[PDB]
Structures are given as C-alpha cells and as structure tokens.
C-alpha cells in the first residue's frame, strides 16, 4: 500500500487485506464509488438522483450505506478473461471469479481509477475515468500475451445491468449504437409521475468501440448453473447473443483474440444512461475513441487542478505530506463544487462544504452565501435546507424542524472574510424566501442573529424542536420546550464573530447587541448546563439535563465542551476539566468519539440518536466533523501538540495494524470511524468508507490557519504557527490573495520569541501586509 | 413430476428443468413462496406488512414481484454437509452449492413443503410447516447415513438473515433461548413514526431444539473467500463462533456427527421474528419439540380440510381431477381467509375472494358484505378499499381514484344467494362510513346501483376517473371526462341481476328502474362504443373511442366482449362477431390474451398500463382472470366446448412442452402466464409465479356452476351441466346446504334430452328441491 506516480495515485496490491477500501470519482452529474474488487455504485442527477446499473433485486432509493455490505451480484466492472487452449478463467478485478493472480494493483488516482492485474501469463491493465460533464463512465481494457508462445483467448466485459423495474424491462444489442441497450420505465402510479418521469434516462448502454464475436443481454442465461463464479457462457465456445424480455438484463460482450509473444490489444467501451439511442449514439461519437478518451482526461485534469487549493507541504511526516497535498483539497473541492448531488444540502452542509470553497474558489463561496441567504424567511429565521433548483423540494432530514440553521452564516463567513477581505459581500442586495423585501447580506445576517435570539428559553437557552447538528437528536425538544447546549454555547461564538465583523463596518449598536447577546448566553449555559467538569448537552422537555455525570450511557458529548471553548462560555479555569474529561472518556487511537460511552437502547427525551447501533454515526463513532471541531477548538487556545495528535489520527496509517483495522485507504477522510471504543474493541476505528462529509473543509481550515498558521486578516497574511514539536524543520507554500509565499520553518535555541524574516530581512510584528498579485515571497519562520 | 400420497402432494425431480417453480403456503399472519431451489420470500403482518430475511441490500418495501429474480444472496433455507473424512460437501436442497445430486424431489404440500436429496452417500429430508396463528416456521431436518460404513459428517443449517437496517443491526448466539438472535432497528426520521413502530419484531430468530458444536452469526465470516460456493467457515474443521456488530448477521449452525451404518438423525429448528427474546422462548416452548410440531401439524391439516369446499371430481382428465380436488379450494380459501394479508383491500378484490368463500365457509361471504357495505359512502359510492382493521390506510392504487367498485356488489352477491339461499342477509342493518344513517343491506345495495346509474356521462357511459377494473388504465379519464366501455357493460349485468333480486324481494318499482337503466346503457353502449365486430374498451377525455380496429396496437380487449355478454348489450347477432374476434387476435396455447397486440409505447390517452412489458401482467399478458370473466360469460351462453377449452388451458401439462415452458408446478393457478404471443413467441406462456389472484373463486364458480352445472336457487339445486363432449362418463361430489349429492354423469345414445334420476327414480324437470341436511342423494345424469 503506498503513493505512486509522484503523488497522483495510490496504489494497493492485495485484494483481500483490505477488502472493502475503495475510492471515489464525480463530475458535474454524476459519483462513483470503486471498490477494490471490482464492486461499484454510480449516481447521478437528472436533476434528482438515479442509477443506471441496479441491484438484482428491487432496491430502495439510496446512494450508499456507512460500511455498506458488498455480496456477489451487486453492481461491478469486471471483465472475465478465458483461456481458449485450456478451458481456464479468470476475472479482473478479482471479483467475481476470485482466482489466484500473480499479480495485483488497486490504483485510486486523483483523475481515474485502474487496476493491473495478471493470472495464466496473461497481463491486464483497467482504466476508469469521467468526463467533466457529461454522465458517462470510460473505459479501457488492455490485455496483454506476457509469454513466449501465442496464446488464443476469449475476453469478456461483465457490466450486469441488474433488476431496472418491475413495470416493465429489456434489453438487446443494437448494431448501430454499436453495443447492449437495456431500458425500463421507472415505476409509478400517479398520473402527475408520468409526467414528472418523462425526461428519465431509463435506458442503460454499454457501447463498444471495436466490434465483438458475440453478446449476451439476459442474466440468467450468462450465468446458467455455472453462476458467477464459472459461467455457463463462457464454458461454450460462443456467447448465444440472447435478449432480454422482461427478464433481467446483463451487458456481456466477447472478444476472440489469437495473441502474439508480448503482444498487447486495447479495447474501449462506454457505460452510463441515456434517454433513448440518439443519446448515447451522442455520446459514443463525443467519447469513444483514443481521441475521445484523451481530450476527456485532459479536460478532467485541468478540472482536477483548477480545484487545487492554496497549501502544499513539506514536513517530516511523508504520509501527512501526501494526504494534504494529493486528496484533501480534491475532496473538499468535490463537496463545494457540487454540493454533494442534492437539489436541497441541508443548509449548515451548504455552508460549511460552501467554505471549505474559500481556500479552493472563493467565488463559489461568495455566490453560496448569496443564494442561501436568498432563502432566508421573513423572520430572520434559515431553512433547514437550500434549494438548487426552481422546483426541486426539501426531502428526508430537510422536513423535520431542525433549530441550528442560522448559527454556520457568521461561523463560516469569518473564514471567507479572513480569507479573501471581501467585506464587500456584505452590502450585496439579497431578497427573502417570500415577501418583497430586499436587504444587503450585512441585514439579513443581522436578522438571523436576532433570531437566534429570539428562539431561546425563559431560562436564555437555545430551543432544540427536533434536533441541532446532531441530525438524529429528536426527541429533547420536540414538545416544544426541550432546550441544547450545544446550540447556546453555538449561538454565543457565533453572536461573538458577528459582534466583530460589526465592529469592523462602524455598525456599533450591533456590535454591542450581539456581544451583550453572547454574554446573556453564556451565563445561562453556566447557570444551566454546566455540570462540574463538562458541559451537558441539553435539557429535555421536562426539564432533565442530559450529557452529564449522573448518565451512564451518553455521559459526555463533544460538541458543547469544543463550542463553550469557542464561544466563551469555557473561562480559564473550565478549560482544563474539558481537556481531561474529553480525553479520558472520548479520546482513542482512531481519534475523538462524539459521546460514550454509546447508546445501547433508546432513550426517549433524547431520540433515535441513542438507537444507532453502538458507535456508528451520531452514536458515539469518531464522527470526524465532531473530531473536527474539538481541533479547531483546541487551535483557538494554542493546545497546539493536542489539536495535532488528534488531526493526525484522522489520517490512517502507516502502522499496518492501523490501516488493516480502518481498512481504508488513506486518499479521503469518511464521515467516521467506528466508536464504542471501550463496549466494542473488536470493530472499533472501522472506516465507514463515506466520503461525504463535512469535515474536510475544517480539516482544510485548520491545517492551513492553524497548524501551519497562514491565516488572512484584514492587513494580509498573519504568521502564527503551530507546529508539532517534533518537527525541527517544515515547509509549506501557500497562496493568499494572488501570490504565493514559499515557506520555511526551523526551531532555533538562539531566540526568546519566534522571529519572521522576508526575503532575508526580520520584520517586527506578524503580519506580512505588503501583497502583490503574482509575487512570490520568501519567509522564514524561527521559532524557539 | 407428478402427484404423490393420494394428492396429499406434488413433487417435482429436477431442480434444474422448472428452476422458478414454487409452491407457497400460509396461515392466519403470515404467506411464504418457496422455490424448488431452495429460494424463499415471507411476509407476516404485525399489523402491516413485514419480513424477518432480508435481502442483502437495503431493498424496497414490497411482497414478490411476477417473474421474481432469484440470485445467489437472495433469502432462502439451506443445509451445507461436509464429509468430514473428504472435505466435499453439498448443500440442500440444491442452492447454494449446486452440486451433482443422485436424488432429488421438491414436495408442495398441502399442509407443507418437503425435500428429499441425496449425495455422497447422505441422504437428507427436509420438511417446512406453520402454525395456524403464529408467525414461526418450523424446521425439521433428517440426515441418514445411507451406505455400508460409519460416515463421519459436519451438518450447518445456513438461514441467511441479511442486510436488517442501517440504522442498527447486530446479532448473537443466545445459549438461553438457544439459538441465534438477529437485531435491528426499522430505519425511520419521524418522531411519530418511533411510535407506530415500537411493536415491531425487530428480531429474527434460529432456534435449535439441539444443541449444537458451533455458529457463526457474521455472513462475510461465514463465507470468506470461499463464498456461498464453499463457504470459508465449512472448510474449517469447526465453526469461529463470531458475532455481528452493525455487520451483515447471518444464522449458522454446526453438528457434527458419526453416523452408524443405516443410521438417521434428526434435528428440530424454528426461524422466525420476534419482539423480543421472550417472545422467541415462548414460540420455542410451545412448537420446538417432536409434540410441538405434530400438534402444530394436525391443528394445521385441520384448518386446511375446514376448507376443503363442495365439490370432489373423478373426469377423464386425471391433471384436472388432481388439480381441482386437491389444489383450488386451498388457493380459494386462501383468498378469503387471509384477504391477501393487507388491512386495505382492493375492494373489487375483498368482494370476489370473499365470493369464493360461498362455496368453503358462506359465513365468511356474508360478514364480508356486511363489513364492505358498513364503509359504503353515504352518495352510495364505495371506496377504492376496505379497511380491515382500526387505524389502517389506504395505500398504493387505492389513493388512486378507480370508478367501478360498486359493480361487485351484485354480480358477488348473486352467487351467495344462488348457494345460500340466505335473502335475510338483506335485511341486516349496517351503518355507512360517515354520518348517523343505519339502513338495510338491501337499501345500502340500491343506493350503490343509484351511484352507478349517476356517475355516466350525457351519453350514459360509465365514468372511468383513473381507471377501472383494469387498475393501471389511468389516463383515458384523468382529466374528468373519458368513460369505460367496460365498466358500462359490466354496469348492465350488474343492474339486471340486482333488478331480478329485487323482483324475488318485491321491491318491483327498484326492479323496475334497474332494468329500465340497464336498457339505457346497453342502447348507449351499442350507440358509441360497438365497433363492428366488437365493443371497445372506452372513450378517452377527448373523445376518441379506443380498443377500435383502427388502433395497431390495443386493436381488441377481452374485458368489454365478457361483460356485454353477460350484461346484454351483446345480442344473438353480435356474439358469434365476439367469439371470431377473441379468438382470432386473443386466443392461444396458454389460454386468452386480455388485449392484442400489446402495447409496445406510452399511449398517454390509456396510459400506465401501455408502458408495461408487452405480455406481462396488464398489457396483454393471458392475465387469467380476464381470462375467466370470459369462461363464465360463455357458459352463461351456453357455448361448452369454447368455455372447457379456455378453462384447461390455465392449468398446465401434461404436455412436457407446455410444462417447461409455463415453468409451474400446477399447485395453483397464476395471476398471468405471458401473453404477447404473436410479438414474442419465445417468452409466452411463462407464469408469473403469483399465486395472489382473484382468478380462483370465479374458476371454481365455473367448475360448481357451469360445467358440472350443479347450481343453488331458491327451490334447491338446479341441474344443469355442460361437460365437454369428450367425457363419456363423469362423476362428482357436491356438497350443498349440508346435504351431500353423488352425481354420475353418464352420455346415452337413447335418449333426445338429458334424464334426471334421484335414488334411481326418474324426476322431472332439473331442480332437486327435497333437501335434508345430513342426506345422501344418489344423482344420475344421462345425456345426449
Ligand atoms: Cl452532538
Ligand atoms: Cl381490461
């Protein structure tokens, strides 16, 4: 397991160590999670989402589960290879066959995903990759005669369609699109479906460029009585070049090749959905050839770099190094760019994945705050979602009253502003979700301040209704009168943001509201939560506090402690008690938990959080957004050597133990790791294998304002570092506002206090406020 | 394939030839279909709908599908045996390993379903059975040593529980309710949804009446790399004992065992869902023991001869006798005892299967009219369902406004009359679903007929909204205006027949104005919707007449030629135009196409049901019970030989040919076989494996009524019959208002029209009318 190609892919050769390790792809419309042995799930919006290759039963609307279970006949990419001289098979990637290989690459790549493989003398080579938008999967096969002598073979793509609609079903080969044409109609009943579905591409292709022997479209006639495992088809000479009526179809293909001594051939195919022929004749004219295939891998590169972000590194740690500079950025960029491929993110999703942007392309971010704020009610009050699209609606966790929405608008605007100085934003002219009343974006952002004034308790606590950040925290306030702790030590950092950016714009009276506001706050949640050594959580509706001492099971949280250090209500003397009580009930070696001990029954004034398994999801895992917070907390008080012991566990590896229990591979964070470290130490660090998460873009922020610490101010570039202290020396070079600054760091015992030179000469202060476009700036950074 | 133990069952000797034959059973909550391969798929209801094996994924909520896919992960109930001396093993009954097998039969049972098979010497029998009220599948396994030597054997049932919920799932071996105990949590979002479902039984169980050497809770464990093929844990000399901890759980047991020569074993199991481990130790104690399953068998065989029904046959035709005494009344009484296990039927569907009920247990049929008329609306229309229980919905098409529900009512009650004789039914007072109006059933039936005669447009055509008994029919009338040719023919015979129960009541001016109604529709029926050689099928909202022989595709429906018939808009000169018609474009091998050609694309003035897979279930298929509307419409016309034919034509074989390619055991009849004969001869025939159809209380309606012509009136029992003319002798057993008739039919050269004997004096006229409950009459029936 390790990096190759000078940092653009990753590679690793066994398919069984790590076995449900993969990596993901995205354009503009579609995702593609790739499994190491081959197993696959692909969606994409049309504008809501769909799939084009199915399970083989009739599955419920999703795109993927945490830890999702891979079995046989779910949707892969395989490509079967027979020897025609023995009889002999084997499969690429490994799946379905699961034969002995001489050899095995996985290759997750910044830009594709491929794998080589080779078994009998036969060498294989798979490539996957997208093109920027159109929804399409491109494919090259190479197969190579490794030996002496020549070798007579049949190979065969293997790319099931699986079981599209109980309404109706087919599939056949189609000379003139040049390969397999499945199609369905989406199940329905209402007539106004009908005409919602119209547009569908519920035609799934998968084309050749070079034409084959033969084909097969009908599953069970592949399969026969040999399954997957040894194909009917393929035990024949040729493939029968069956149909599919009403029967669950399947793309299979078969080339016959005679093939010299070190001879190799390449075959291309193209596999996605389609509204009808016409639609992928389309595609096959644009994508497949060499050419086709070429210009999309350039364009996708360029696509890949313009999303590159504005930190690479050099520290004694390689495996730090390649995470930061190779996949994070392409993860956060993958987060703002397209928002996860919903029509409604949940609004703080929109925000925080919205300003992870501000290091990438801040002007997405500037045009995210713009649009949601757009969507504001009348009465200052946000959305628990924001909508993409004219029609689109919210849906699942969108529906129910969630109270936290207004809390990220300040919080993530910080960094934007830090980041860029566009305090000119703020004097934007926005409209609300109704009425005729527009307003700058500093109005609007004053009102959802007050509002969350306003949505608090006669004791000044936060109302929780249905649930705060943690999604799934239902049932505290869902009479009506349940209160968080989390949201009023939340709502005092952010009242207290906001309170600054006031006072930068002369908008005084605000400014004062706001951190009196903070200050009424964060005495109710001393009077209130506070529990003696941690912060509770919440009060319910009849008037239990959660979180605290006296719960054997969700004892302590997270979150309040990260929150009351940000947002004040955490004095001098609260800090350490957060510190140890976090670390002697929350932290393990796969990071910080979120709660714990973990749920084990439902509690039913906190909700369907405490029914999650014990330590998946909000159930006490390392929820890595959590985790993420605690950081930024622990970097806002200078607990440099904590915030970095537990940023690094984010990142698996390289002790093997590790990355065999995470049984990730180290190209993406996931939304978490397993939890219930101390009820459950069998499982305990499993990856769930999610890409989607929040987390990275404050993973992102505090690598580079705070560990690294380049941080924007409203003067420029601000130094202030917090480096671990086993480095004794690190580089990084950051680009700010159009220039770059080529950083060096050293620890030096000649000095008191850290000592800043530009371009060779000490400057005094820490700012570098003298900034041109397209200069490059040298800075030394000695620290004691 | 054929019948054993005096009908008790029909076993089938290749698990290759039929690979999607299945026979199903039942009990008071809950149906299981199981195939011959060992594929299996059970709903219990807890009220609603539920399942305790789950597919591997997350799947959609849903009973079977016609044509149901089965794959390799897919739910089902095996044995692995390992020769412990060889390391080979195979599996019962044949999946998942498939291996070469020296025995094999799969038994439908009555009562239960059974296998025997043999391999490597061992000789297993496996045996499947319910309860009659509660949801437990009872297991019981033998294992016989069957050669000369002692054999040394490893034995693991394997009841994959697969993927419960991403929400929570786990499991564990339980030594105190001794066996395996699988764990989840139903995924929801709404707190009121936490409440609705907190009954649920969330836990699956395996539980052994022996102790076993080992298990295996955790599925990838149980497999490895090995897979199903040769599962990982089988090549193991024991069993790891692992549990699952939000992983995939699975049920596997390990005995391992020397058998003497000769020797057999038996081991006991239950399998089923639980709240809790309570209620699986209750279960247990109650059936897990030689005594629990045979009072558990003989309470059930006892249910299923209560409803045995009236009517034992001995024909020419040995598949039809078989069939028709041993496999319809359980398929009929299926129907009305359970209503399909949903709280909300269809209400055409309640009305014909409680119809069915007439002939097995009319007190049934009698609450049945009682309860549907009680939630009558007070307009006289009658709802899309009937809701079976406090608190149920209506779901899926009844949400969906249909307009022919009322025409039940009659056209079923008329066969409860004919067999009962119980006019004073009529007279029970009922309520309506809203307001305080309680008023006879008789009142109640006026006031559907009523509703019936309004809801018609200027041209006195039945309104058809979003459709009619043709269910996805959904856009000839969306838009308020478009009428069904079928429901204004079906809405004659129902006024006619209701019209005479009104002149047998004396309630004349009703007669009166029935039949005068029942002329109006009949004249506008021949006035817009006779086509020249036959009706069409209805009038879309902007006024096109459609199932024409202008239309290429839909150019004849059955359902309006059946029912003009019946309801005399089809006079002596137009039926021989119907029966050339239907069998020229409708008729085939596998009985009578509902409409040809199939629709091959969305026709949005007719709508859903054109975008069906020609041939499958509404769009063309031979959908049997529109094939058996037109059985019954030809026997009430006399026509024997057409209405025989068509009626054998649904049972299959013994035809080899006509066996493997309908792919059914004939245990029941299916909701389809696959119709576009014409456009696709390679699929036609094909069943849909449903065993849900209201098909089988109008086919044995047929068999009492029409062919062996042994029908109720208010004098006593009508002799009437109309064998085919091949049958030179005949006899049947008819049960009838608690007497008994042993009928001899018998063809004579020497007489001009048929002669009645009674205890072998000759009567005249055909009504038997001196009926002593407890009797035996002698009845001989000669014929021309
Ligand atoms: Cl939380
Ligand atoms: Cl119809």
Same mark, same amino acid.
């Given at each position: 397991?390790?990096?190759?190609?000078?940092?653009?892919?990753?590679?690793?050769?066994?398919?069984?160590?790590?076995?449900?390790?993969?990596?993901?792809?995205?354009?503009?419309?579609?995702?593609?999670?790739?499994?190491?042995?081959?197993?696959?799930?692909?969606?994409?919006?049309?504008?809501?989402? %769909?799939? !084009?290759?199915?399970?083989?039963?009739?599955?419920? $609307? /999703? @795109?993927?589960?945490? &830890?999702?279970?891979?079995? #046989?006949?779910?949707?892969?990419?395989?490509?079967?290879?027979?020897?025609?001289?023995?009889?002999?098979?084997?499969?690429?990637?490994?799946?379905?066959?699961?034969?002995?290989?001489?050899?095995?690459?996985?290759?997750?790549?910044?830009?594709?995903?491929?794998?080589?493989?080779?078994?009998?003398?036969?060498?294989?080579?798979?490539?996957?990759?997208?093109?920027?938008?159109?929804?399409?999967?491109?494919?090259?096969?190479?197969?190579?005669?490794?030996?002496?002598?020549?070798?007579?073979?049949?190979?065969?793509?293997?790319?099931?369609?699986?079981?599209?609609?109980?309404?109706?079903?087919?599939?056949?080969?189609?000379?003139?699109?040049?390969?397999?044409?499945?199609?369905?109609?989406?199940?329905?009943?209402?007539? %106004?479906? !009908?005409?919602?579905?119209?547009?569908?591409?519920? $035609? /799934? @292709?998968?084309?050749? &460029?070079?034409?084959?022997? #033969?084909?097969?479209?009908?599953?069970?006639?592949?399969?026969?009585?040999?399954?997957?495992?040894?194909?009917?088809?393929?035990?024949?000479?040729?493939?029968?070049?069956?149909?599919?009526?009403?029967?669950?179809?399947?793309?299979?293909?078969?080339?016959?090749?005679?093939?010299?001594?070190?001879?190799?051939?390449?075959?291309?195919?193209?596999?996605?959905?389609?509204?009808?022929?016409?639609?992928?004749?389309?595609?096959?004219?644009?994508?497949?050839?060499?050419?086709?295939?070429?210009?999309?891998?350039?364009?996708?590169?360029?696509?890949?770099?313009?999303?590159?972000?504005?930190?690479?590194?050099?520290?004694?740690?390689?495996?730090?190094?390649?995470?930061?500079?190779?996949?994070?950025?392409?993860?956060?960029?993958?987060?703002?760019?397209?928002?996860?491929?919903?029509?409604?993110?949940?609004?703080?999703?929109?925000?925080?994945?919205?300003?992870?942007?501000?290091?990438?392309?801040?002007?997405?971010?500037?045009?995210?705050?713009?649009?949601?704020?757009?969507?504001?009610?009348?009465?200052?009050?946000?959305?628990?979602?924001?909508?993409?699209?004219?029609?689109?609606?919210?849906?699942?966790?969108?529906?129910?009253?969630?109270?936290?929405?207004?809390?990220?608008?300040?919080?993530?605007?910080?960094?934007?502003?830090?980041?860029?100085?566009?305090?000119?934003?703020?004097?934007?002219?926005?409209?609300?979700?109704?009425?005729?009343?527009?307003?700058?974006?500093?109005?609007?952002?004053?009102?959802?301040?007050?509002?969350?004034?306003?949505?608090?308790?006669?004791?000044?606590?936060?109302?929780?209704?249905?649930?705060?950040?943690?999604?799934?925290?239902?049932?505290?306030?869902?009479?009506?009168?349940?209160?968080?702790?989390?949201?009023?030590?939340?709502?005092?950092?952010?009242?207290?943001?906001?309170?600054?950016?006031?006072?930068?714009?002369?908008?005084?009276?605000?400014?004062?509201?706001?951190?009196?506001?903070?200050?009424?706050?964060?005495?109710?949640?001393?009077?209130?939560?506070?529990?003696?050594?941690?912060?509770?959580?919440?009060?319910?509706?009849?008037?239990?506090?959660?979180?605290?001492?006296?719960?054997?099971?969700?004892?302590?949280?997270?979150?309040?402690?990260?929150?009351?250090?940000?947002?004040?209500?955490?004095?001098?003397?609260?800090?350490?008690?957060?510190?140890?009580?976090?670390?002697?009930?929350?932290?393990?070696?796969?990071?910080?938990?979120?709660?714990?001990?973990?749920?084990?029954?439902?509690?039913?004034?906190?909700?369907?959080?405490?029914?999650?398994?014990?330590?998946?999801?909000?159930?006490?895992?390392?929820?890595?957004?959590?985790?993420?917070?605690?950081?930024?907390?622990?970097?806002?008080?200078?607990?440099?050597?904590?915030?970095?012991?537990?940023?690094?566990?984010?990142?698996?590896?390289?002790?093997?133990?590790?990355?065999?229990?995470?049984?990730?591979?180290?190209?993406?964070?996931?939304?978490?790791?397993?939890?219930?470290?101390?009820?459950?130490?069998?499982?305990?660090?499993?990856?769930?294998?999610?890409?989607?998460?929040?987390?990275?873009?404050?993973?992102?922020?505090?690598?580079?304002?705070?560990?690294?610490?380049?941080?924007?101010?409203?003067?420029?570039?601000?130094?202030?570092?917090?480096?671990?202290?086993?480095?004794?020396?690190?580089?990084?070079?950051?680009?700010?506002?159009?220039?770059?600054?080529?950083?060096?760091?050293?620890?030096?015992?000649?000095?008191?206090?850290?000592?800043?030179?530009?371009?060779?000469?000490?400057?005094?202060?820490?700012?570098?406020?003298?900034?041109?476009?397209?200069?490059?700036?040298?800075?030394?950074?000695?620290?004691?």
């Amino acid at each position: 397991l390790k990096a190759i190609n000078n940092g653009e892919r990753y590679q690793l050769t066994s398919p069984t160590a790590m076995p449900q390790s993969a990596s993901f792809l995205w354009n503009k419309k579609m995702m593609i999670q790739v499994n190491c042995r081959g197993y696959a799930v692909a969606q994409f919006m049309q504008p809501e989402p %769909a799939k !084009y290759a199915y399970a083989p039963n009739l599955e419920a $609307k /999703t @795109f993927m589960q945490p &830890e999702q279970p891979y079995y #046989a006949h779910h949707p892969g990419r395989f490509f079967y290879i027979k020897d025609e001289e023995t009889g002999e098979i084997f499969s690429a990637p490994y799946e379905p066959v699961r034969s002995q290989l001489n050899n095995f690459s996985f290759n997750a790549g910044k830009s594709d995903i491929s794998w080589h493989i080779a078994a009998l003398g036969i060498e294989v080579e798979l490539c996957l990759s997208l093109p920027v938008d159109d929804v399409v999967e491109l494919w090259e096969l190479k197969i190579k005669n490794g030996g002496a002598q020549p070798r007579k073979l049949s190979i065969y793509p293997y790319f099931p369609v699986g079981y599209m609609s109980w309404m109706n079903q087919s599939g056949d080969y189609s000379q003139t699109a040049g390969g397999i044409i499945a199609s369905c109609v989406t199940p329905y009943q209402k007539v %106004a479906d !009908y005409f919602k579905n119209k547009d569908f591409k519920d $035609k /799934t @292709f998968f084309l050749h &460029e070079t034409a084959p022997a #033969a084909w097969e479209v009908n599953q069970k006639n592949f399969e026969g009585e040999g399954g997957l495992h040894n194909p009917n088809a393929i035990q024949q000479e040729t493939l029968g070049c069956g149909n599919a009526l009403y029967e669950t179809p399947t793309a299979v293909l078969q080339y016959r090749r005679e093939l010299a001594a070190q001879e190799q051939q390449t075959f291309r195919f193209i596999f996605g959905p389609a509204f009808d022929e016409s639609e992928a004749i389309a595609l096959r004219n644009k994508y497949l050839s060499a050419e086709g295939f070429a210009k999309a891998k350039s364009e996708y590169q360029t696509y890949i770099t313009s999303g590159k972000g504005c930190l690479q590194i050099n520290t004694p740690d390689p495996e730090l190094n390649n995470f930061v500079n190779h996949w994070l950025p392409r993860q956060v960029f993958y987060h703002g760019d397209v928002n996860r491929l919903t029509t409604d993110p949940q609004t703080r999703n929109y925000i925080q994945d919205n300003m992870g942007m501000s290091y990438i392309k801040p002007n997405i971010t500037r045009q995210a705050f713009l649009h949601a704020l757009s969507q504001q009610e009348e009465s200052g009050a946000m959305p628990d979602g924001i909508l993409l699209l004219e029609g689109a609606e919210l849906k699942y966790i969108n529906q129910i009253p969630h109270t936290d929405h207004c809390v990220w608008l300040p919080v993530c605007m910080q960094a934007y502003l830090d980041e860029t100085n566009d305090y000119a934003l703020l004097d934007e002219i926005v409209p609300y979700a109704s009425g005729e009343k527009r307003e700058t974006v500093e109005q609007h952002m004053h009102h959802a301040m007050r509002w969350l004034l306003q949505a608090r308790d006669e004791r000044g606590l936060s109302f929780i209704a249905q649930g705060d950040w943690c999604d799934p925290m239902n049932m505290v306030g869902y009479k009506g009168k349940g209160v968080s702790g989390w949201l009023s030590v939340a709502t005092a950092y952010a009242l207290n943001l906001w309170a600054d950016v006031c006072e930068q714009r002369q908008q005084n009276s605000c400014a004062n509201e706001f951190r009196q506001g903070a200050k009424d706050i964060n005495a109710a949640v001393n009077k209130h939560i506070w529990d003696g050594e941690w912060f509770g959580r919440g009060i319910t509706d009849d008037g239990v506090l959660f979180g605290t001492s006296k719960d054997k099971e969700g004892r302590i949280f997270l979150n309040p402690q990260s929150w009351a250090i940000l947002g004040g209500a955490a004095d001098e003397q609260k800090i350490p008690c957060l510190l140890d009580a976090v670390e002697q009930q929350l932290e393990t070696p796969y990071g910080v938990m979120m709660l714990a001990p973990a749920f084990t029954a439902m509690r039913d004034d906190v909700g369907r959080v405490t029914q999650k398994f014990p330590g998946s999801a909000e159930n006490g895992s390392v929820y890595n957004h959590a985790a993420v917070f605690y950081i930024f907390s622990l970097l806002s008080i200078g607990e440099s050597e904590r915030a970095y012991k537990l940023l690094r566990q984010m990142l698996p590896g390289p002790d093997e133990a590790d990355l065999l229990q995470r049984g990730q591979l180290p190209v993406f964070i996931p939304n978490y790791y397993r939890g219930a470290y101390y009820q459950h130490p069998r499982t305990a660090g499993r990856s769930s294998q999610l890409f989607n998460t929040g987390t990275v873009s404050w993973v992102y922020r505090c690598l580079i304002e705070g560990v690294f610490g380049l941080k924007g101010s409203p003067q420029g570039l601000v130094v202030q570092p917090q480096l671990p202290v086993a480095w004794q020396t690190a580089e990084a070079v950051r680009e700010f506002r159009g220039a770059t600054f080529n950083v060096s760091y050293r620890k030096s015992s000649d000095i008191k206090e850290m000592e800043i030179q530009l371009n060779e000469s000490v400057i005094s202060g820490n700012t570098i406020s003298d900034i041109t476009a397209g200069a490059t700036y040298q800075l030394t950074v000695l620290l004691p």
